Design a protein around this ligand. Structure first.
Ligand SMILES: [Zn+2]
Lengths: 52, 42
């Protein structure tokens, strides 16, 4: 689903009014949820999110 | 005296900023039940 959504959107050239800026999007990757603790990364669980 | 979650360790922390378990990384603590007499009617 996400790959089709990102592939469908096409970014055209950006011109304020020579130099021009164009952007593009590659493969979309999603990582597993992880809690960003102060000490180190920890496993994230649904009940941890519910309690916190 | 407070009990941590997945890790077994007594917190015993009463400071306001102390919410994270010592020698641990999780911030979930359970209050421990002391030895107190409670009367119930059957
Ligand atoms: Zn702990």
């Amino acid at each position: 689903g996400l790959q089709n959504v990102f592939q469908s959107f096409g970014e055209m050239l950006v011109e304020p009014s020579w130099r021009y800026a164009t952007v593009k999007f590659g493969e979309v990757t999603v990582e597993k949820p992880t809690f960003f603790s102060d000490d180190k990364e920890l496993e994230f669980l649904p009940w941890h999110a519910r309690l916190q | 005296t407070y009990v941590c979650g997945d890790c077994g360790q007594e917190n015993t922390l009463k400071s306001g900023d102390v919410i994270q378990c010592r020698e641990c990384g999780y911030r979930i603590l359970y209050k421990k039940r002391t030895r107190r007499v409670v009367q119930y009617e059957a």
